[PDB]
């Protein structure tokens, strides 16, 4: 639980703590076991998990993050229970063993529904059809594998849950004897995650789990990783990363728009990142939670023209072939569509080679929040415009 | 049938005392007033009695009743009525004592309106922190003196002007030039020389 020594950890501290010499385990089975242990908990086990000796704002941020983790884990528990109930119902209705239902297909479903309808069980046939149709969506073992790994990574990062998965008094199902198993699967799974997924923190921040410092640092790390993988001669100096001449590959961390923007003032145009690739300039701006500040945040056409002219002046790129454009990113997360657009526009990478470079990209399936329609409309009308020339 | 609260009250009356007071009190009885003093020489300096007077506290027409629904009920969850109050400090003349004027609501069913009446309380401040003009929250407590049973729980809004005047050496609030009359007769000024 919460202790005086307990403190939140960073990614480096997590890697330092959860370490394994070697070996390969069944990550899917380990994840299922850990999630079953989490679901076995009562609501009281989430109470004393915030370290006391911290400032109030930091404690509030930690509380919000832990509440988000609890909500997501409860939603996944409900989804898992519904999946298991559907599988059990299909098995009972059809007579097949409980393991082959996942491998059965639509033709088998048609045959079984026809058999039930012929036997006169129209109600059971309809229930079977509905159960199979809704089971096709959530029947995969790794339905939300990435998000579940991010949840477990966040639990590890909290630093108050690593000891909550051991010292359990358990009965051996074979010999019917009581013992206390000291094997902790949570540590093994977190060690496997940190050993295999090198960008697990980046995925965690992109999914929106990071409530303290947003995701801008992870975005910068992702962008500089792509830039170095492309250039192969990338040189970094503080908040500016530049390639070795040739084709222009420049990443500039101008400032953080959240602190740069000041309410009640009039100043239009504050960019977060500036990316120069070839003769193109892209202004990557992270939106704010305040809908009245986005209009200030987006720079004007005159500002874009002036920035392009300054790029021509400094880098010597001829004014004839110079394009500039904006790129608005969601405020608290980074969805799959936004990431794909970022890869396509900024780094000029097609989907196939982007997935070749990044394994976790194809399984990243985060979508935009349906509630925020102001941001969605602004992002559409900002990303559907053509490049500003000269 | 749904029985009104009058039925329950009558039930309680019948339980406590055998039966209920249903005797048809003769409300039509002719009440009379026989004068005993002169036409204008009634023995009182404030009010003069010349007819039958109303009796009772809650039987006065027009009716006045308490109105619990006000700012205090909107803000605080009172364990008992009038346990917590909010007011302004209106005097610190007494040592370790702060006088607070609070507001409550009186309801007039005949006119269907409510009014804010003012009451003064002797709140207690130990360390002498209250300054006149402070918006304070006060709570009931034990008996402290002959008329002190409230204490300043918290100071919501300190009077910066009063504190700065005290630091400068002046009174927290300058005394009003008007006030109470010493008599019915008009108090005339005396701008006369010693000879006159």
């Amino acid at each position: 639980h919460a202790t005086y020594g307990a403190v939140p950890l960073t990614h480096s501290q997590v890697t330092s703590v959860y370490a394994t010499d070697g070996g390969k385990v069944d990550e899917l089975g380990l994840l299922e076991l850990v999630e079953e242990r989490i679901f076995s908990w009562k609501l009281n086990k989430w109470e004393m998990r915030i370290p006391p000796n911290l400032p109030n704002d930091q404690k509030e941020l930690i509380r919000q993050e832990q509440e988000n983790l609890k909500q997501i884990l409860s939603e996944w528990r409900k989804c898992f229970g519904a999946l298991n109930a559907d599988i059990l119902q299909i098995s009972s209705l059809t007579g097949v063993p409980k393991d082959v239902v996942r491998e059965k297909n639509r033709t088998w479903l048609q045959e079984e529904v026809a058999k039930l309808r012929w036997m006169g069980e129209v109600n059971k046939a309809a229930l079977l059809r509905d159960a199979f149709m809704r089971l096709e969506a959530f029947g995969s073992r790794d339905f939300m594998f990435m998000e579940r790994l991010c949840c477990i990574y966040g639990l590890a990062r909290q630093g108050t849950f690593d000891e909550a998965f051991t010292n359990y008094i358990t009965e051996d199902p074979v010999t019917n004897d009581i013992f206390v198993d000291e094997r902790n699967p949570f540590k093994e799974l977190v060690a496997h995650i940190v050993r295999n997924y090198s960008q697990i923190d980046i995925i965690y921040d992109f999914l929106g789990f990071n409530y303290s410092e947003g995701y801008r640092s992870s975005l910068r790390r992702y962008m500089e990783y792509l830039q170095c993988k492309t250039a192969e001669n990338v040189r970094a100096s503080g908040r500016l990363v530049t390639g070795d001449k040739g084709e222009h590959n420049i990443l500039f961390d101008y400032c953080v728009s959240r602190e740069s923007l000041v309410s009640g003032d009039s100043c239009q145009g504050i960019i977060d990142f500036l990316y120069i690739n070839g003769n193109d300039v892209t202004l990557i701006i992270i939106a704010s939670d305040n809908p009245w500040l986005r209009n200030r945040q987006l720079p004007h056409r005159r500002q874009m023209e002036g920035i392009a002219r300054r790029v021509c002046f400094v880098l010597g790129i001829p004014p004839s072939e110079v394009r500039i454009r904006n790129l608005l990113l969601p405020p608290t997360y980074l969805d799959k569509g936004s990431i794909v657009r970022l890869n396509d526009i900024v780094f000029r990478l097609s989907n196939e080679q982007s997935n070749l470079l990044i394994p976790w990209l194809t399984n990243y399936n985060k979508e935009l929040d349906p509630k925020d329609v102001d941001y969605t409309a602004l992002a559409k009308t900002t990303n559907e415009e053509e490049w500003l020339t000269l | 049938p749904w029985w009104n609260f009058q039925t329950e009250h009558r039930q309680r009356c019948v339980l406590m005392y055998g039966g209920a007071r249903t005797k048809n009190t003769h409300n039509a009885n002719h009440r009379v007033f026989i004068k005993k003093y002169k036409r204008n020489a009634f023995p009182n300096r404030t009010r003069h009695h010349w007819a039958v007077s109303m009796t009772g506290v809650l039987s006065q027409r027009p009716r006045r009743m308490p109105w619990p629904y006000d700012l205090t009920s909107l803000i605080f969850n009172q364990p008992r009525q009038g346990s917590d109050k909010i007011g302004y400090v209106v005097g610190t003349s007494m040592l370790k004592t702060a006088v607070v004027a609070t507001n409550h609501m009186v309801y007039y069913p005949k006119f269907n309106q409510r009014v804010s009446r003012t009451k003064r309380f002797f709140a207690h401040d130990e360390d002498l922190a209250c300054v006149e003009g402070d918006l304070v929250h006060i709570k009931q407590c034990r008996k402290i003196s002959k008329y002190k049973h409230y204490y300043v729980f918290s100071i919501l809004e300190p009077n910066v002007e009063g504190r700065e005047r005290l630091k400068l050496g002046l009174k927290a609030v300058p005394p009003p030039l008007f006030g109470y009359p010493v008599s019915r007769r008009i108090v005339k000024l005396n701008l006369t020389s010693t000879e006159g």
């Binding site: 076995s40 908990w41 008094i169 358990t170 009965e171 | -």
Partner: protein, 94 residues
Amino acid sequence: DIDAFKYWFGVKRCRLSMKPWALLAKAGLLPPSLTQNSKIMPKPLFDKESLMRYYLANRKDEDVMAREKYLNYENSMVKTEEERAAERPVAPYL
């Protein structure tokens, strides 16, 4: 009232008059009152030797009497072995 009567009679231990006692004797809550006596038979006469002889003839077991008075005075909702076994957890203890 039955619940209130039992509360005042057992917990608070209130007194009792004779007319209410007779009425409750009719109601079956209480046995017939002390004053509900007929003239058909006079009061019994007690003899110590006869009483002792009857007690010796019919003396109950110590444990049996203790259990009877425990059930009458202390809790009468005593769980059996089956109830205790059903209460005991058998599932994986979490």
